[PDB]
């Protein structure tokens, strides 16, 4: 009947395990019922129509002259914008256009209260926001994509290489990075990666598309685990499984080979594909968009792990997080494909610096700041449920009491 | 049909005033 000096610890373990399980289940409860809503949100938002704005100023306006003010949800707005103001559009294959538009739309729509731009001295003053091989010193001030015509075969320059990057910081993510590259021989790459801050226990999100002459030759998407055992939390595995059952069903199960280099960083549910026709590509695209959106929405409610004086478990957790992110960075650096397509065009002393400082940098002693602008939500609120000051109350009781005589 | 025409019109109308106010703010409160 009495208890033992050990089974107390058994009780502690069981309690914290049931707590973790409960919260992980609560996280998936939202996607579980209807997974299709992770890709079909734009179509539904379009279906519901343009909302009418009811704020005192707009009501007074549309009553005075005629002018009705209309609004649109965030999904429709980021669908109207599209590949908004990228300077290298008009050169991008429509598939890469679609994917970039969707990914940046989810960033701007979900993280909008804390999304900042990465510090400008780290990438944007070195001239890394738009890179051209025919002008490696920026003596045309970044208009080389328009001033210099494409070199013909055999001339000094063939083939030309162009890159464009965008880097953001946020509250949970220390870096959200999207980069597009074009080469004259008919090659186009797209590379997206999302790193959580050094104090959050989340996997790293990653996507790569490589298409040649309009045909997608390689496509890989995965949530690379960050722990030492290559094991995600329960809810990440559950969501990936549910989404693969939803979108990828009826497609190739044997084409999902695992690259030799990913075998040390990939999760057991990574997706690598050389698509066959249009249906495979459509399935993969829907799946990638849905997976990204689910990942961001589950990040919306993350809490850091803090190291308390005396606690060793949290120190161990922090060290494991740091080492997992570093392992990902150093094992991505030897993906020799992009490395060589860079270095055979821009040199090597440039390539090493660029790949070290921007693509896969890892310095735990520096993570960029952010700017929390949540107070904005107050202002918007109080412009549609306003309050009028103590003298409109008399006028309104007069209006009611005199109108109610009918 | 009308969907895409409305998309083009609205994009143009919005980007106009966005750029107008961005330059106003920059010149008045940041060049200084």
């Amino acid at each position: 009947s009495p208890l033992s000096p050990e089974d107390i610890m058994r009780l502690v373990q069981q309690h914290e395990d049931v707590a973790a399980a409960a919260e992980s289940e609560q996280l998936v409860a939202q996607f579980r019922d209807d997974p299709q809503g992770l890709y079909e949100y734009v179509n539904r938002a379009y279906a519901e129509g343009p909302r009418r704005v009811t704020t005192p100023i707009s009501l007074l306006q549309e009553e005075i002259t005629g002018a009705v003010t209309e609004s649109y949800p965030a999904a429709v707005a980021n669908d109207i914008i599209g590949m908004g103001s990228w300077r290298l559009k008009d050169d991008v294959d429509p598939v890469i256009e679609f994917l970039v538009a969707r990914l940046e739309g989810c960033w701007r729509e979900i993280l909008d209260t804390d999304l900042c731009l990465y510090p400008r001295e780290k990438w944007k003053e070195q001239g890394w926001d738009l890179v051209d091989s025919m002008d490696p010193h920026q003596e045309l001030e970044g208009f080389s994509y328009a001033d210099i015509p494409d070199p013909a075969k055999g001339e000094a320059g063939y083939p030309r290489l162009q890159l464009e990057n965008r880097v953001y910081c946020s509250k949970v993510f220390r870096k959200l990075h999207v980069e597009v590259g074009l080469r004259q021989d008919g090659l186009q790459v797209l590379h997206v990666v999302v790193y959580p801050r050094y104090s959050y226990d989340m996997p790293i999100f990653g996507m790569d598309i490589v298409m040649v002459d309009g045909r997608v030759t390689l496509a890989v998407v995965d949530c690379c685990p960050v722990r030492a055992d290559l094991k995600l939390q329960p809810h990440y595995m559950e969501t990936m499984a549910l989404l693969q059952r939803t979108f990828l069903e009826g497609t190739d199960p044997a084409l999902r080979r695992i690259p030799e280099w990913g075998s040390k960083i990939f999760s057991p549910l990574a997706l690598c594909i050389t698509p066959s026709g249009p249906e495979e590509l459509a399935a993969f695209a829907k799946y990638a968009v849905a997976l990204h959106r689910a990942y961001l929405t589950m990040s919306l409610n993350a809490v850091p792990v803090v190291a308390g004086p005396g606690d060793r478990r949290e120190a161990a957790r922090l060290q494991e997080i740091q080492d997992g992110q570093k392992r990902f960075c150093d094992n991505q650096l030897v993906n020799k494909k992009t490395r060589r397509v860079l270095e055979v065009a821009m040199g090597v002393e440039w390539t090493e610096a660029y790949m070290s400082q921007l693509m896969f940098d890892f310095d735990p002693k520096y993570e960029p700041p952010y700017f929390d602008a949540s107070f904005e939500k107050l202002y918007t609120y109080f412009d549609e449920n306003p309050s009028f000051g103590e003298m409109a109350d008399e006028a309104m009781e007069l209006e009611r009491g005199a109108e109610a005589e009918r | 049909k009308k969907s895409f025409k409305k998309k083009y019109k609205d994009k143009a109308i919005i980007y106009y005033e966005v750029g107008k106010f961005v330059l106003n703010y920059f010149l008045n409160n940041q060049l200084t």
Partner: peptide, 10 residues
């Protein structure tokens, strides 16, 4: 009045 974009629903 036309699309010109690629979307996975044709």
């Amino acid at each position: 009045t036309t699309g010109f974009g690629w979307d996975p629903d044709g």
